[PDB]
A paper describes a structure:
NoV VP1 can be divided into two major domains: the N-terminal shell (S) domain and the C-terminal protruding (P) domain. The P domains form the outermost, dimeric protrusions of NoV virions, which plays critical roles in receptor recognition and host immune responses. HuNoVs recognize human histo-blood group antigens (HBGAs) as host receptors or attachment factors that play an important role in huNoV host susceptibility.
The positions of the glycan binding pockets were located at the outermost surface of the P protein near the interface between the two P monomers, similar to the typical [name] binding sites of other GI huNoVs. The binding interface of [name] P protein resembles that of DSV, in which its “bottom” is also composed of the four conserved residues D332, H334, S389, and P390. P390A of [name] was the only mutation that did not change the glycan binding ability of the mutant P protein, presumably because this residue interacts with the trisaccharide through its main chain carbonyl group.
Author numbering:
A (entry chain D): 231 to 410, 414 to 533
B (entry chain A): 231 to 533
Write the structure that this text describes.
């Protein structure tokens, strides 16, 4: 039988950045289509895009340093050191999906070292030499690292594109994985009947973010892990959820979780919808309903 | 009904550092006693020490910058910004438990910013002014940050203690959480091997460690996703130990027997050499078999 975690949202992680859920929101400006590659999972527990099981795999890169004429960078592997297979994902699992911005990362050797001198602040730009699908990315800060040095890089902060084609960091945009083409997790659309996609918002270090520090995702990481663990057969077109008060277990709103692993509500006329709900509530599965089951409006 | 995650180990996180499980081991040198404060949970889902629900809360510090008595640091809060209550727990939830080393962290404001110039490389030393239990730590790299600037710091790497009292980083050692007596601090209790040839199973992950006693390796007593699972399930503990099989999901073979105790740690009986689970593959899955007595004798594991 299908279930969602009985865990308060404010204790759970974003599925695109390793950061606690701070709020829920709907977006009129950005909610018409998203194609996030992290936080992508079916309700019967099939991982999609670059989505890992663990939050500890999120926004990390592993590779061997290459030195090329007018570029240095990484020949990419999976985080565990094993080969990257194109038949599995558009990039190695846990690869960041924050498109069209600079990635400021801390890179360390995957071999035992004595001193912090071998730890490098690197900058990955999304320009011509950004080709994760082809297994190669260019990175600044590697000029003094020996060729074939194996390193793990962890995303620290993001800033506007070095080439200046954008003024801000747009956390709704995914990368262009590179091609000469990647099998992306499919686009998510609001399915009609006044329904808006629910976004789980977390703060991440972003210089000039369109929404300041806020990064949206379509499902908490611990929900991803739960579905992968349970492998519950999908026995309906949508799973009806209640968002409960953690003290009283009283119903604060109705939500539909679709087989494609994203969630919707109908926001109240006023505007905000789930944004006015408290963030220490718990989702509970009620029953399977049709994809045209009409939800009561949520919020003020 | 009690269960453990049906997920391969190599896809799961260490519960002390946010890093994938690379191997299992028993420890002759360190396995007689551990008192890790992260990865601490009962089988019926009670969090202990500083253990968070989420791997994303691990090895993070949140606080407001102070300048006092020629030393700079943080008045600590919980990671969600809510107040840290002193004299109640060893430290805020997710606070690192890597004792007697320097913590090199990246600190960023919890308020929107325009430039990366506000992002600071800080060093937290475990010296006289390291008092997380009292809700205060000192850090190098904060002299140029305005008083009351609210920041989250994320652990990047650790190195030997600046004061030189130790030559390497020992990842088996927990912090001294103030000038308070360890007995008066509200620590998750010590874990002992329970007898009958049983050794504590340690889940090993690589973390960026300069001059580590075990190189990059950090041990923990349970995968983070196991912690979350027990907190979610709240399964009543109906036995003295939970018997597990470690299965190869590809070959359909039982690779070894393990006992998971109510205190949330796992044991095996290692072979004569004492290498035990270290030779097992890391892509296996644990499954709950049944509740057994503390005297239930396990088949030896390894080579
Ligand atoms: O050995 C203690 C200490 O080592 C590093 O500090 C050294 C410093 O002692 C030396 O004089 O200069 C180098 C070059 O930058 C380092 O700053 C670590 O930084 C420190 O955390 C501690 O591990």
């Amino acid at each position: 039988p299908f279930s969602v975690p009985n865990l308060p949202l404010n204790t759970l992680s974003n599925s695109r950045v390793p950061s606690l859920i701070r709020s829920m929101m709907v977006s009129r400006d950005h909610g018409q289509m998203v194609q996030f590659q992290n936080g992508r999972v079916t309700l019967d527990g099939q991982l999609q895009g670059t989505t890992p099981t663990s939050a500890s795999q999120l926004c990390k890169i592993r590779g061997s340093v290459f030195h090329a004429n007018g570029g240095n960078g990484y020949n990419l592997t999976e985080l565990d050191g094993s080969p990257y297979h194109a038949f599995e994902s558009p990039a190695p699992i846990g690869f960041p999906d924050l498109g069209e911005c600079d990635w400021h990362m801390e890179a360390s050797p995957t071999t035992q070292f004595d001193t912090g001198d071998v730890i490098k602040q690197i900058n990955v730009k999304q320009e011509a030499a950004f080709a994760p699908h082809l297994g190669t990315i260019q990175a600044d800060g590697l000029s003094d690292v020996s060729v074939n040095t194996n390193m793990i890089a962890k995303l620290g902060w993001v800033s506007p594109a070095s080439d200046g084609h954008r003024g801000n960091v747009d956390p709704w945009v995914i990368p262009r994985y590179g091609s000469t083409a990647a099998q992306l997790a499919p686009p998510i659309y609001p399915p009609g009947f006044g329904e808006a996609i629910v976004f789980f918002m977390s703060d991440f270090p972003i210089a000039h973010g369109a929404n300041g520090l806020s990064v949206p995702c379509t499902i908490p990481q611990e929900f991803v892990t739960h579905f992968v663990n349970e492998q519950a057969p999908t026995r309906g077109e949508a799973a009806l959820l209640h968002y409960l008060d953690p003290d009283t277990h009283r119903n604060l709103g109705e939500f539909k979780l679709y087989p494609e692993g994203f969630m919707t509500c109908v926001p109240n006329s006023s505007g905000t919808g789930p944004q006015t709900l408290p963030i220490n509530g718990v989702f509970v599965f009620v029953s399977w309903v049709s994809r045209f089951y009409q939800l009561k409006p949520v919020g003020t």
